[PDB]
Design a protein around this ligand. Structure first.
Ligand SMILES: [Zn+2]
Lengths: 66, 82, 114, 177, 101
RNA sequence: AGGGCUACACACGUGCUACAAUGGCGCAUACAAAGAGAAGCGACCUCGCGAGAGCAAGCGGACCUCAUAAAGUGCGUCGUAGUCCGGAUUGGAGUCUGCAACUCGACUCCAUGAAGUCGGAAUCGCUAGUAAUCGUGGAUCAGAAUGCCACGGUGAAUACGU
């Protein structure tokens, strides 16, 4: 392909709360810190909560009422 | 705000209806009225049709959609401009 | 002055020229001036560099100009993003805290243009 | 792209059995992916197309090709040769890499993701979908963004039936709700 | 005479006095430090909202006895300013008379 | 059952606050009046900056609670600055009530604290304890007032005249 017009396609890291770290090339540049992936995803599971996927459980145990 | 010593507020019908759903489906909402009930992190992933005075406006429960009231997401007056 | 990346004034009571931090009124000003152990009515130009560094590393226990600014920004950001009513008041740049709206709120709305 | 390797090895291995193909060249291949963004309203502003262009440029590591309206039309008050689109052609490893990127980052990132469709296959195992919002890609800022513009996609394969593209994509564990 | 509003008030007061001393202690369960906020007083709240919100003593407007008026009420006499002024003029209120100083 | 009466391009009307050194803050310090008080006041006590919470005596009251009056006085501080004036707004975190505080409660703490430099044309009130100001209490009231009513506290000018 051409040069100097195509965006930069470095390989960055997709490290999700899923805990999976994948090396994709993209136009991101920085190390990417995620929340959900092809794994730890609802549709890719049947578990409610497919991963902590957000610690608002903390506030929910900050107010404890159950 | 609500007193901590007092806790959260949520209708029992809402909780139990919510429970039967987390028992027995994921695919459809509930048609509620309790704009004053709170959103439990356990209701996440649902898209309940909450009343607003005349209409059951639906609200998809997400992580951040936890610490407010059902009435917070069913506006009541329709302003457009003058 | 250059503490916390800002340039708090000089020839000013220490509690007061401490109020210049975006996040310190007088209360937190006094709080810091005590937690570091410096007199209040000592002007800023009346302060040494040991106490300054003490202040540097004492104010640090708060959120600061850029950090706090950004912080509140992200808070309102979650407001807007979450899709709530307060988010809508904020979106409009209106009273968010429950004021009357048909006449007042020349603070959020701005003066009576139309 | 690992997906490419995975294809070449495991998906290849699977499909030769799955279709009983006697020649690997008879076996389907993903040949290209085209991301078209029918901006359309670029008749209004250039920068939105530019923003869309920046968007389609940022999302995939390949400068875009700005499409133009074929003819002028009154139904959209578009004049002929006017840039009412922007698209990119991903093929090869970039295609595969963006593929892995896609199916493993942005597909979760779907709002109320209920599964991806299994029928928007144009008849020859060439799939076609619609994206409503770009923010699913973390290549987006979501704060320094200008719109929620989507685009449409035509993943043109060498599979020849819609079902074959379906099976092929299933080999990639496509959602297929 | 709007006997609908007055039947609502009487019905509301009747059930608040029926289930009285119940939401009282159901509240006593909740302003006290025990019950772990989740074991007794929490289940207690459930029981609260099972209990008719229409048995609370705050839903009442404290309406005038003769007219059932929402406004201008006065906890001393139980009647509006109007009905009470007419009685005051007529002398049926012992001792009451227009003040002047 | 919910929502509205609380919507908000806007205009107006009342009312509140301020724009400052005759003052702001801090400190200390006294002088009221009146009323209310029992599904209430609630001393104290204890916790909690605090919202308040627990504890809780007494009080149906010339006796117990609101309940310190504030303004003042003196100390210092601020030093005329959008300021140590302001304190809008907004964020967060609370306290409180209620079935419940999103619409649509109040308060508390922290934190930015906006306009705002005394105000067009015009225009209002008032002749003495009045104006002016200080504060107080009460009603309604689950909770809810800058409004209402009432109390005291400082306390002046000019009315030639038509
Ligand atoms: Zn993940």
């Amino acid at each position: 392909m051409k040069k100097d017009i195509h965006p930069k396609y470095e390989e960055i890291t997709a490290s999700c709360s899923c805990g999976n770290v994948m090396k994709i090339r993209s136009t991101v540049g920085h190390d990417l810190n995620l929340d959900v992936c092809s794994k730890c995803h609802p549709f890719f599971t049947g578990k409610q909560r497919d991963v902590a996927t957000g610690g608002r459980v903390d506030r929910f145990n900050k107010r404890f009422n159950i | 705000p609500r007193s901590l010593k007092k806790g959260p507020f949520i209708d029992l019908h809402l909780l139990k209806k919510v429970e039967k759903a987390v028992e027995s489906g994921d695919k459809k909402p509930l048609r509620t009225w309790s704009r004053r009930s709170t959103i439990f992190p356990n209701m996440i992933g649902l898209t309940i049709a909450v009343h607003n005075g005349r209409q059951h406006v639906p609200v998809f429960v997400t992580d951040e959609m936890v610490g407010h009231k059902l009435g917070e997401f069913a506006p009541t007056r329709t302003y457009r401009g003058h | 002055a250059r503490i916390a990346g800002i340039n708090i004034p000089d020839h000013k009571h220490a509690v007061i020229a401490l109020t210049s931090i975006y996040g310190v009124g007088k209360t937190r000003s006094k709080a810091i001036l005590a937690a570091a152990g410096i007199a209040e009515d000592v002007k800023i130009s009346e302060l040494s560099e040991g106490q300054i560094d003490t202040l540097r590393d004492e104010v640090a226990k708060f959120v600061v100009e850029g950090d706090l600014r950004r912080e509140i920004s992200m808070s309102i950001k979650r407001l807007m993003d979450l899709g709530c009513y307060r988010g809508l008041r904020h979106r409009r740049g209106l009273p968010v805290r429950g004021q009357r709206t048909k006449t007042n709120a020349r603070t959020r709305k701005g003066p009576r243009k139309p | 792209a690992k997906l490419h390797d995975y294809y070449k090895d495991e998906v290849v291995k699977k499909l030769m059995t799955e279709f009983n193909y006697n020649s690997v060249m008879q076996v389907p291949r993903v040949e290209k992916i085209t991301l078209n963004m029918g901006v359309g309203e670029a008749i209004a502003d250039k920068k939105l197309l530019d923003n869309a262009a920046a968007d389609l440029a940022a999302i995939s590591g390949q400068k875009p090709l700005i499409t133009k309206a074929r003819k002028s039309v009154a139904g959209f008050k578009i004049r002929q040769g006017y840039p009412i689109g922007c698209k990119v052609t991903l093929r090869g490893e970039r295609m595969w890499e963006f593929f892995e990127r896609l199916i493993t980052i942005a597909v979760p990132r779907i709002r109320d993701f209920r599964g991806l469709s299994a029928k928007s296959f144009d008849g020859r195992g060439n799939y076609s979908m619609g994206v409503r919002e770009q923010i699913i890609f973390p290549e987006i800022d979501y704060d320094k963004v200008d719109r929620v513009r989507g685009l449409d996609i035509t993943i043109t394969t060498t599979a020849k039936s819609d079902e074959e593209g379906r099976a092929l994509l299933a080999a990639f564990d496509f959602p297929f709700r | 005479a709007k006997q609908s509003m007055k039947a609502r008030e009487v019905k509301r007061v009747a059930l608040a006095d029926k289930y009285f001393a119940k939401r009282a202690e159901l509240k006593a369960i909740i302003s006290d430090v025990n019950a772990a906020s989740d074991e007794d007083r929490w289940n207690a709240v459930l029981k609260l909202q099972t209990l008719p919100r229409d048995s609370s003593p705050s839903r009442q407007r404290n309406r005038c006895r003769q007219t059932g008026r929402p406004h201008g009420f006065l906890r001393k006499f139980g009647l509006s300013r109007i009905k009470v002024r007419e009685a005051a003029m007529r002398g049926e209120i012992p001792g009451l008379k227009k003040a002047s100083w």
